[PDB]
Amino acid sequence: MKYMITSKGDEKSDLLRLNMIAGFGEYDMEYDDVEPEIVISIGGDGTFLSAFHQYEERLDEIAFIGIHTGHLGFYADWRPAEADKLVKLLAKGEYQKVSYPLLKTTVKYGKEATYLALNESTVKSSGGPFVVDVVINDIHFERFRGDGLCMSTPSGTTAYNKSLGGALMHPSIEAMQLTEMASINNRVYRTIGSPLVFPKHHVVSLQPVNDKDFQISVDHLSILHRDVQEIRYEVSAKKIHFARFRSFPFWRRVHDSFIED
Amino acid sequence: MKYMITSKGDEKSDLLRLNMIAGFGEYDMEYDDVEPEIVISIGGDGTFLSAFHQYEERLDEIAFIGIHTGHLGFYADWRPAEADKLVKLLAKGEYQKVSYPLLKTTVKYGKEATYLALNESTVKSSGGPFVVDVVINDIHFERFRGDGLCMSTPSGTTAYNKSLGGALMHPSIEAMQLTEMASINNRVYRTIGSPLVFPKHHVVSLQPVNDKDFQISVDHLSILHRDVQEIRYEVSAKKIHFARFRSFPFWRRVHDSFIED
Amino acid sequence: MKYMITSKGDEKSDLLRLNMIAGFGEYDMEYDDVEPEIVISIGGDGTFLSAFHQYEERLDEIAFIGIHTGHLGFYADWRPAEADKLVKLLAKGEYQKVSYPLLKTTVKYGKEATYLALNESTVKSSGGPFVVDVVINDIHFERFRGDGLCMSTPSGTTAYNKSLGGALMHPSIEAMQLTEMASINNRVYRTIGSPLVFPKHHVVSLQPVNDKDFQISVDHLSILHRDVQEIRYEVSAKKIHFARFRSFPFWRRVHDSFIED
Amino acid sequence: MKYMITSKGDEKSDLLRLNMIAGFGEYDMEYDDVEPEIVISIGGDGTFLSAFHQYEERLDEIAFIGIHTGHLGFYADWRPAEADKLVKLLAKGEYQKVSYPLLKTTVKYGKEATYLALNESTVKSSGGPFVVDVVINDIHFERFRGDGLCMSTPSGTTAYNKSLGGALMHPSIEAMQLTEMASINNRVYRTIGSPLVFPKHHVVSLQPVNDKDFQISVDHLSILHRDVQEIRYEVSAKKIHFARFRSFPFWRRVHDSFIED
Numbered sequence A, B, C, D: 001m002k003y004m005i006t007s008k009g010d011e012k013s014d015l016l017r018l019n020m021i022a023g024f025g026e027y028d029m030e031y032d033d034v035e036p037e038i039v040i041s042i043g044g045d046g047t048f049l050s051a052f053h054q055y056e057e058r059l060d061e062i063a064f065i066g067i068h069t070g071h072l073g074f075y076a077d078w079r080p081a082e083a084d085k086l087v088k089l090l091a092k093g094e095y096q097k098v099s100y101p102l103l104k105t106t107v108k109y110g111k112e113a114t115y116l117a118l119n120e121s122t123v124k125s126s127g128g129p130f131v132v133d134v135v136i137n138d139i140h141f142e143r144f145r146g147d148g149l150c151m152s153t154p155s156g157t158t159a160y161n162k163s164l165g166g167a168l169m170h171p172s173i174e175a176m177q178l179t180e181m182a183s184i185n186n187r188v189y190r191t192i193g194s195p196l197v198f199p200k201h202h203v204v205s206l207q208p209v210n211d212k213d214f215q216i217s218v219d220h221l222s223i224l225h226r227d228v229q230e231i232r233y234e235v236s237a238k239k240i241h242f243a244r245f246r247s248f249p250f251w252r253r254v255h256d257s258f259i260e261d
């Protein structure tokens, strides 16, 4: 079908892209980076996150594949030496698609902006002290004082969420997980402490208490938002689709990245 | 229908049981503690856990209700002053049933024993050093050295799991969560560290490395098991059913128990 | 002697300052905010931290006292109703002095700047990814990747250090304590994880790996530093002196702020 | 002088002991395991802990040395190939002594027993729920509910203390550090959470609330104590002395054991 290939842009990744393009030319494969059906990302997880966001408006028409030219990625989980076998198996098609949940972020002003995250969305203050009221399904749950909050997809749980103490969640679970960044807890100030895992259709809303300027990140993108009234998180109805050609289970991917490989 | 009432056995709880029994006698309600359809537990979460285990072989025919005569429970979430309104609404029926996941534990010797947990199951060594190989869906994930492991239901996530650093999980999510107890981590010894959340149909198996004697707990019950070859955890196909008469959301129950009430 | 009084600047604190000034006028007490020997801070810990920094160049000639007009402070540990008894006991003198350690921070460019902290000093990146080599007494200890690092005095251990997982340290111990902010840890990236407690005369140095711009905080002051070659932490030879009129032990102060009061 | 050598008792360690004994016979060295002045431990940290306890009543007359025949130890920090150079440098003497703090544990009944720990002392319940009142210098600090408590020396901070979230403390600091094992924390139950570091002459006392039977461990030794009224921890006035022949700094030892070697 139509395909395209992003590269991290170092010499290794560019030349592997040029070779795969050449191998694709020997099949009924057309390079189209406007409406691809296959997006191959060559580089690391940062390169893969860029490719997701380049094509986030055509998620349902696209299957993604990551090739790691450095260390193993959680998303970029094919090796460079497998690239020619990848070209072949994929020109034919007849591959399985695997789908992972995404996180929808809505930011409301005094106007709305929506974003999709594959790893996580985080909120930190814009200089002052971060204080937000945390409301779950319209129920006021807690007043959070500290550095910030992190809302993670299942496949993001091994990224920032992990470094914050979060649980690792199998990506077949349709959920999102909220972790704390350095909460204050004393006599007058109380947060839950524990990470929180929310199912589909639960809405977690962050509302400002005084300062209304926040630094909001979505995966690698970090935007200073002013005059913010609300930040709403829920599990997205949209999913990212991977093309799979072999069994590479999530927990094995986890063992390989963190225990040893 | 047929009903029964367990009491914590202090004066407050016994007398509230006697009064509810009296109120039930004014309806088509028959006290039967052999085949009840309604099990009311009066006391705290420990009393409720006992009632679950007393009737674990008739989970599908029974709806449970907890009355907390001390502080609020996660399971025992009606107040004593509501008891007469409880008698009434429940003689009529026309109540909704709510179902929470359970954890199946299988212990294999060199023979099998199965247990159901509403809170969690834990494994600790029987005196020596605890070392177990942790295998996920037949894939060797890690060699765990430390005090022990805890496998939690969703509604157990606010119990022992919470004190071990685990995430709180909404009980609509069909999953189980594994936390570490004091793992050793140095140059030669590596565990994941993070809690792990597993979906339905994933099997987590613990296999001994040297010592084969373990202390296995299931909720409040703690059994020394000898000549153990394997401990297998999976989300149960069975569920516990609660009778609900009002909206009392899980996250509100969490806010009330941990943030303030 | 010579004294001065800072106020948080709300009505409560201003008027308590005016009343204490009036009470001092009935003794051989002269208000001098250029070379005081007694500095009274009225407000909270933030007000007390400001007063420390206003007079950091005359630490050895000054005894400090904090009055908390809001909740109890760790530094501002007298109540407003005790103020008149404070005026009296202090005009006479004959009070004990108590001394707490401070943290020296040195920032080197390509030039040096020194700062003293009563709570802590922290380093975070200026937008990009924070990567620093951590060198202890000229020995390369670790390469830290993550959000940042926090170096705490003993009396700062109940502040930011606490929210980062650090240990609480009795202020009679001449030490400093380093905690991590969200470290990355996988196959290729390793930090110690644990907080580290250093004695006097140990030098902890942070050296940039790529980006050389950092946000460095000292207590409440936060400065963007450019062209930074090194950040050096050691226990200061200078100490802050408190005037004490009663026994109020540190662990009791800790119990009162965090367990209940 | 008089010396002796303990072995882990596998073939490697026994034969290295026999060779060092032979090398010592070529000097004015007499093997005496009743009143040695030099105690060499061959094996790992467990072997070294045994040697400390074998000779705990002659700590001040003895210098200790550890040889690691397996991985590097924190105590057993010479390699087997250095053994002949060790024999030589040590027959001459003219070595520096290095001293580390120890922890005194006192257990009172209704009678007293004292123990010295080089790593830590821990208290866990004997089957039931562990509840103890924690009293610091006769001030009631907290009521601890959970699995247990761990009191660590500075050189023990890299052992059990580390796995419990404690800080690593340089052994020149005369202190002890208390960590929690799985504390319960909700609306009605509050502990500090953070590790606590205590200086010399502070006394931390654990007093039973209901159950008075506890499992008390001291380093590798674990004793069930009945009819316990109190457990008192303080930094010992006694110290353990190491013989040093080279610079091997603590933080380097830490880097080598946990970061990589």
Ligand SMILES: N=C(N)NCCCN(CC#Cc1nc2c(N)ncnc2n1[C@@H]1O[C@H](CO)[C@@H](O)[C@H]1O)C[C@H]1O[C@@H](n2cnc3c(N)ncnc32)[C@H](O)[C@@H]1O
Pocket: A128, A129, A130, A145, A146, A147, A181, A182, A183, A184, C044, C045, C046, C049, C073, C074, C075, C119, C120, C155, C156, C157, C158, C159, C160, C161, C163, C219, C220
């Ligand atoms: N929160 C933001 N963004 N900035 C707040 C600015 C003013 N702060 C003054 C203070 C203090 C203080 N010293 C102690 C002490 N010695 N012991 C125990 N309480 C203590 N306070 C208490 O800390 C609470 C918050 O302030 C109040 O209750 C105050 O009672 C500056 C100080 O904040 C600290 N700080 C900054 N960010 C965080 C964070 N994420 N988590 C925890 N503390 C944080 C840091 O340690 C700095 O010095």
Ligand SMILES: N=C(N)NCCCN(CC#Cc1nc2c(N)ncnc2n1[C@@H]1O[C@H](CO)[C@@H](O)[C@H]1O)C[C@H]1O[C@@H](n2cnc3c(N)ncnc32)[C@H](O)[C@@H]1O
Pocket: B128, B129, B130, B145, B146, B147, B181, B182, B183, B184, D044, D045, D046, D049, D073, D074, D075, D119, D120, D155, D156, D157, D158, D159, D160, D161, D163, D219, D220
């Ligand atoms: N693991 C069980 N159930 N019992 C093991 C019995 C023998 N132990 C001897 C030792 C040691 C030691 N001292 C240090 C030190 N000073 N610094 C850094 N390494 C150190 N070791 C290392 O600890 C590892 C395990 O042993 C080895 O690698 C050894 O290299 C007794 C000691 O175990 C410690 N221990 C007990 N239970 C746990 C646990 N759950 N987590 C962490 N440590 C634990 C405790 O602190 C005790 O004293």
Ligand SMILES: N=C(N)NCCCN(CC#Cc1nc2c(N)ncnc2n1[C@@H]1O[C@H](CO)[C@@H](O)[C@H]1O)C[C@H]1O[C@@H](n2cnc3c(N)ncnc32)[C@H](O)[C@@H]1O
Pocket: A044, A045, A046, A049, A073, A074, A075, A119, A120, A155, A156, A157, A158, A159, A160, A161, A163, A219, A220, C128, C129, C130, C145, C146, C147, C181, C182, C183, C184
């Ligand atoms: N580190 C800074 N300041 N910015 C880095 C920018 C580029 N990042 C791309 C990625 C990724 C990624 N996804 C996963 C995944 N799904 N699973 C497991 N590894 C994963 N990586 C790995 O994360 C490491 C660092 O990047 C690499 O090894 C990469 O292999 C953006 C992403 O960083 C994450 N991030 C930001 N800050 C921190 C932090 N303090 N601690 C931990 N992660 C952090 C965040 O989750 C964001 O989306």
Ligand SMILES: N=C(N)NCCCN(CC#Cc1nc2c(N)ncnc2n1[C@@H]1O[C@H](CO)[C@@H](O)[C@H]1O)C[C@H]1O[C@@H](n2cnc3c(N)ncnc32)[C@H](O)[C@@H]1O
Pocket: B044, B045, B046, B049, B073, B074, B075, B119, B120, B155, B156, B157, B158, B159, B160, B161, B163, B219, B220, D128, D129, D130, D145, D146, D147, D181, D182, D183, D184
């Ligand atoms: N504490 C000891 N040694 N044994 C106590 C025996 C009786 N327990 C009944 C219960 C419960 C319970 N379920 C929940 C829930 N679903 N959600 C939130 N609260 C919950 N409770 C609360 O847990 C507190 C303690 O009990 C009470 O307040 C009760 O309200 C058995 C249960 O203890 C739990 N447990 C055991 N040891 C620890 C520990 N170290 N830390 C934390 N919990 C622990 C474990 O999860 C087991 O099932």
